[PDB]
Amino acid sequence: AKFLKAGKVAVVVRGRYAGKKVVIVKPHDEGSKSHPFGHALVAGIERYPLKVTKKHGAKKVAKRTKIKPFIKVVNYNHLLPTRYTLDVEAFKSVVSTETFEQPSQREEAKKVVKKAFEERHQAGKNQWFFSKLRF
RNA sequence: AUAUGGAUUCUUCACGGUAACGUAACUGAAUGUGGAGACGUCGGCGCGAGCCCUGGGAGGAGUUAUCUUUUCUUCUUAAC
């Protein structure tokens, strides 16, 4: 009866990313010395790709499909779990507790996440995840 | 009207905080939505400003047969 697993998709509810979909990578149920609460390490989308029609040229399609990712430690109370799933094995090793608290390692993980999201978006799958929420 | 500095970009249009949110900055046309402009009267209570009262001290003046370390007066600080 536990659903906050390592591939669950949730919606951020607070903190500059509210209304943006996210996928849980590493959960921490019994808190930690820092962040003494139930929290998860998540990677999400900050700038969703724009809709592409058949009239768009080669240059414009590549521009409109760019995705800007982010990584964040989020309290459980600030997430809204969904029923969707997204495999994270391609980038689970690069995001962890170590990659935070260091500016250089945060950017290295983000570009790896960006490449994974771009390839996932191409050859369309997980269409709900890449669709911007309307509110 | 315009230039320089700063900021931003090879992940093109910034990062931090669990969060409330923070910052020297940190593209946004049509169209749409929201806020400010924009609001009665009476009652007590809290707080601020000016005034009033008052202690010590540094100056000036008055009274002094007798008494009064005394009576009066100056000691101020704007927008931004």
Curated annotation (Swiss-Prot):
GO terms of biological process kind: cytoplasmic translation
Additional information: Present with 7380 molecules/cell in log phase SD medium.
Gene label: RPL27A
Gene Ontology MF: a single term: structural constituent of ribosome
Protein name: Large ribosomal subunit protein eL27A
Transmembrane intervals: none
Similarity-based family: Belongs to the eukaryotic ribosomal protein eL27 family.
Keywords: Cytoplasm, Ribonucleoprotein, Ribosomal protein
Organism listed in the record: Saccharomyces cerevisiae (strain ATCC 204508 / S288c) (Baker's yeast)
Subunit field text: Component of the large ribosomal subunit (LSU). Mature yeast ribosomes consist of a small (40S) and a large (60S) subunit. The 40S small subunit contains 1 molecule of ribosomal RNA (18S rRNA) and 33 different proteins (encoded by 57 genes). The large 60S subunit contains 3 rRNA molecules (25S, 5.8S and 5S rRNA) and 46 different proteins (encoded by 81 genes).
Taxonomic placement: Eukaryota, Fungi, Dikarya, Ascomycota, Saccharomycotina
